[PDB]
Amino acid sequence: ASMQKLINSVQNYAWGSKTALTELYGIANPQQQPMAELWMGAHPKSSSRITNGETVSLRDAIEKNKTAMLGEAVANRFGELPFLFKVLCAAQPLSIQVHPNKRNSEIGFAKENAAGIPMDAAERNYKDPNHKPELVFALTPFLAMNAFREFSDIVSLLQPVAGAHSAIAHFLQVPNAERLSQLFASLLNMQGEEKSRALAVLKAALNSQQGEPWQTIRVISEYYPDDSGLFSPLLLNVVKLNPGEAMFLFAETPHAYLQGVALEVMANSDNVLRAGLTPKYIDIPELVANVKFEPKPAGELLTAPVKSGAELDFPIPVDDFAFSLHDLALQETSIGQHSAAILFCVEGEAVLRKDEQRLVLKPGESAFIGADESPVNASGTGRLARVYNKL
Ligand SMILES: O=P(O)(O)OC[C@H]1O[C@](O)(CO)[C@@H](O)[C@@H]1O
Ligand SMILES: [Zn+2]
């Protein structure tokens, strides 16, 4: 068939919401498992499936017909579906992460390869010799951290906890990148009574400070009461995304998803260094070597989308994938691209038409459109999200 309704994987990671996908989309969860990620794509560990037919892996379907399904551009640039499209349901706060830049990704990938670390081992931090974009788009109000605050904001936030650690006093004395770097490494490396003393100072502050980011620290502390990452909302921008707002997650930049439901667009294979809010051991020298200690003003956090007719594009400084929202009307509009696409119903209801074939998508449902089947006409109400390739 021209248009293929997707059967998608739900990853039941423990931090997932037992209700979100069900409440929002009516996805069945009789056993009340936590449902953390809904995957739409062709990841080798869990490809989406299509039916027509028997059920086949989308990955297997693409592999047998790359140019026809991916399009020439993608078949030749990437040799596979270059994006993975997720619904994320964060019921608990997740780890602080840093994605290394292109150069350092090549090195760490090679280091781990030379060490003979299986690509799907838990020890594996680098799974791609490249850096690629990651886009998060809020479906419900979405709490997160992203990037270092302006130095003067950090100074103001650290004052109430100046006595927690000498590294904090050190930074306040000269609030610059070097000392911010030293502060970040010192906090992460706190041990024993040094650590517990610092956390005691922070906890006392939680009792005499109001509003954000103190409230976020309190929320996080319920899950990570003994984590040096509790200091992080004082260093990093805490953001509350309204539904329909999005952020691009740059290289070398600490970020964390704390609560809510979001769409995420990424590559299949990524590199992750942890920077707190984790029971895993962190290699601090490596983390610090891969972080860029420069402030990012809050006014620059959201990606500014571009509206053209019924289409709202979210421009991405990368060839690997593109992301747009399409407002549906009862009169058909053409949705076309020179690549494979995944269309996901955000809300309302979508009817997709290709000549004689019609395909209905209720919210939470998605379809794969092969490059050779573009365009399709969409009508209905609400909004359709599309991941594809602009090349
Ligand atoms: O899967 P993506 O696109 O890489 O997103 C996750 C992140 O991990 C990285 O691969 C690490 O370099 C980044 O490219 C990316 O920002
Ligand atoms: Zn990330």
Curated annotation (Swiss-Prot):
A Pfam cross-reference name: PMI_typeI_hel
Domain of life: Bacteria
UniProt signal peptide: none
Residue sites binding Zn(2+) per the record: 97, 99, 134, 255
Keywords: Cytoplasm, Isomerase, Metal-binding, Zinc
EC number in record: 5.3.1.8
Primary location class: cytoplasm
Coiled-coil spans in chain: none
Cofactor: Zn(2+)
GO cellular component assignments: cytosol
Catalytic activity: D-mannose 6-phosphate = D-fructose 6-phosphate
Note on cofactor: Binds 1 zinc ion per subunit.
UniProt cross-references to Gene3D superfamilies, sorted A to Z: Jelly Rolls (2.60.120.10), Phosphomannose Isomerase, domain 2 (1.10.441.10)
Cellular location(s): Cytoplasm
Enzyme class, broadest EC rank: isomerase
Annotated GO MF terms: mannose-6-phosphate isomerase activity; zinc ion binding
GO BP terms, alphabetized: carbohydrate metabolic process; GDP-mannose biosynthetic process
Active-site residues, Swiss-Prot/TrEMBL: 274
Family of the protein in this entry: Belongs to the mannose-6-phosphate isomerase type 1 family.
Job of this protein: Involved in the conversion of glucose to GDP-L-fucose, which can be converted to L-fucose, a capsular polysaccharide.
Protein name: Mannose-6-phosphate isomerase
Species: Salmonella typhimurium (strain LT2 / SGSC1412 / ATCC 700720)
